[PDB]
Amino acid sequence: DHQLLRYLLDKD
Amino acid sequence: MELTPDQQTLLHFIMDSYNKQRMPQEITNKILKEAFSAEENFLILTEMATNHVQVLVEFTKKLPGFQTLDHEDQIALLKGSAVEAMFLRSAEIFNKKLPSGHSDLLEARIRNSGISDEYITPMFSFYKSIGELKMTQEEYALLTAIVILSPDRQYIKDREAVEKLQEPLLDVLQKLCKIHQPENPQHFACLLGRLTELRTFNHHHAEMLMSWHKFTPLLCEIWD
Numbered sequence: 001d002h003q004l005l006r007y008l009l010d011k012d
Numbered sequence: 013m014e015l016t017p018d019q020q021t022l023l024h025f026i027m028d029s030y031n032k033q034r035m036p037q038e039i040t041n042k043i044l045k046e047a048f049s050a051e052e053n054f055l056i057l058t059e060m061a062t063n064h065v066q067v068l069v070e071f072t073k074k075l076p077g078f079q080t081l082d083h084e085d086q087i088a089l090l091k092g093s094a095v096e097a098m099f100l101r102s103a104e105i106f107n108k109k110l111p112s113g114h115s116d117l118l119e120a121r122i123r124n125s126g127i128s129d130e131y132i133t134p135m136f137s138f139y140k141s142i143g144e145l146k147m148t149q150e151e152y153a154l155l156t157a158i159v160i161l162s163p164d165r166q167y168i169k170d171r172e173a174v175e176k177l178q179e180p181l182l183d184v185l186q187k188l189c190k191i192h193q194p195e196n197p198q199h200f201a202c203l204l205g206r207l208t209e210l211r212t213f214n215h216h217h218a219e220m221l222m223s224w225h226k227f228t229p230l231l232c233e234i235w236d
């Protein structure tokens with residue numbers, strides 16, 4: 001769950 | 013009276029991260045060019061809301077102390093503020109950003125996108141009430157940070173940690189009201205008035221989604 005929000009949050 | 017160097021620093025970090033935002037040329041060209049149909053209008057709003065969630069995540073990450081919070085709390089704040097931040101940003105664009113003739117075209121599209129008048133009427137009323145305050149860019153940035161760093165959102169593990177981050181932003185905002193509008197002592201109270209009015213859009217939006225064209229991955233996932 002929340003795979004896109006997590007991806008955007010953790011990038012850089 | 014003035015902001016302390018510590019408050020000036022906190023304000024500058026918020027302002028720098030807020031001013032990074034820009035409406036993609038691709039989306040603005042669609043507002044100008046795409047056919048006037050309920051389907052094409054709905055898709056334009058979808059592209060706008062998807063762009064905003066990306067812009068919102070980038071802004072949030074840069075918020076002083078946000079990165080120092082528990083990872084699950086970081087996600088719960090993003091999820092709980094997504095709808096409120098969207099309406100606040102949409103109010104800013106309406107009262108500023110978009111040109112006279114170009115905003116008239118976007119308003120035409122919103123009023124012909126399949127959204128019920130039960131949701132269009134409180135939305136444009138909120139835009140007007142925000143417009144009346146003639147908010148500065150500092151006020152829009154701080155209000156967005158206050159919305160995001162809300163310690164009373166559902167599923168936060170360490171609420172006191174979030175309170176420690178939000179309290180200084182409210183202190184700065186109240187001080188900026190006293191400095192820039194010393195003749196209007198109710199200015200901060202009116203800003204709080206827009207914050208409570210923003211909270212009602214959570215129910216208006218959740219009801220709107222329940223009425224139903226599908227979603228984008230950032231949309232029904234951050235919107236539940």
Ligand SMILES: O=C(NCc1ccccc1)c1cc2c(n1Cc1ccccc1)CN(S(=O)(=O)c1ccccc1F)CC2
Nearest residue numbers: 054057058060061064098101102105106110115118119127
């Ligand atoms: O542009 C806007 N308001 C400003 C404005 C207005 C009239 C003239 C000039 C300017 C504006 C208002 C709304 C929505 N938008 C785009 C936007 C702007 C800014 C940030 C995110 C989204 C989208 N939402 S939504 O619930 O997310 C949604 C997503 C997909 C399909 C249908 C939808 F309703 C609806 C309300």
